[PDB]
C-alpha cells in the first residue's frame, strides 16, 4: 500500500515476475499452450458474475484499511463514511484488474490478447533492466 495515500499500488517496471530462466524451463510450446490460456481461464471463472468478487473482497479490503489507518496513527475520527468510500474504491480497482484479463477482443484477434501484451511487457529487456539487484532480473 502507498505510504502517503490509502491505495493499492505496485510501481515496478514489470507487471509480474517472468524471467528468461523460467521461460526456458517452461519452453515456448508450453508457454503458448498452458501459461497464457490458464490466466484467462481463471479470470473468466472468477468474474462470471461481477458482484461475487467484490463481495468476496469486501472484508479483506476493510481489514487492510483498518491496519493502514492504525499504523499511520491518524484515524482521529473512525469515520464510517470514509471507510466505506475507500473500501469501495479499492475493491473497484481490484475488480477492474480482474475484469481486464477476462475480456475478449472485438475484431478477429485471439481470445487472450491482453495476456499476451502483458507477457510481452514482462519479458521486454528494456524494462527488465530497471529492476533492483536483489530482484535478480536475470534468472
Amino acid at each position: 500500500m502507498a505510504p502517503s495515500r490509502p491505495l493499492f499500488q505496485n510501481t515496478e517496471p514489470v507487471p509480474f515476475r517472468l524471467t528468461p530462466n523460467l521461460q526456458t524451463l517452461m519452453g515456448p510450446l508450453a508457454t503458448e499452450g498452458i501459461f497464457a490460456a490458464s490466466v484467462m481461464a481463471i479470470a473468466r471463472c472468477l468474474t462470471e458474475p461481477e458482484q461475487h468478487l467484490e463481495h468476496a473482497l469486501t472484508l479483506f479490503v476493510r481489514d487492510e484499511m483498518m491496519f493502514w489507518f492504525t499504523n499511520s496513527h491518524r484515524t482521529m475520527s473512525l469515520t464510517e463514511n470514509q471507510l466505506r468510500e475507500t473500501v469501495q474504491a479499492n475493491c473497484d480497482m481490484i475488480v477492474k484488474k480482474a475484469l481486464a484479463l477476462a475480456q475478449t477482443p472485438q475484431g478477429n484477434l485471439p481470445a487472450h490478447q491482453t495476456v499476451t501484451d502483458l507477457i510481452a511487457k514482462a519479458t521486454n529487456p528494456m524494462n527488465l533492466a530497471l529492476c533492483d539487484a536483489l530482484w535478480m532480473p536475470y534468472l
Partner: peptide
C-alpha cells in the same frame, strides 16, 4: 521467416527465449 520454425515472432504470439528479441 525461416518457415516452419517455432522461434518466429508475431504480434499475436509470445516472443520465445532462444532468439535475441523482437
Amino acid at each position: 521467416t525461416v518457415p516452419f520454425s517455432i522461434h518466429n515472432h508475431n504480434p499475436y504470439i509470445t516472443p520465445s527465449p532462444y532468439v535475441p528479441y523482437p
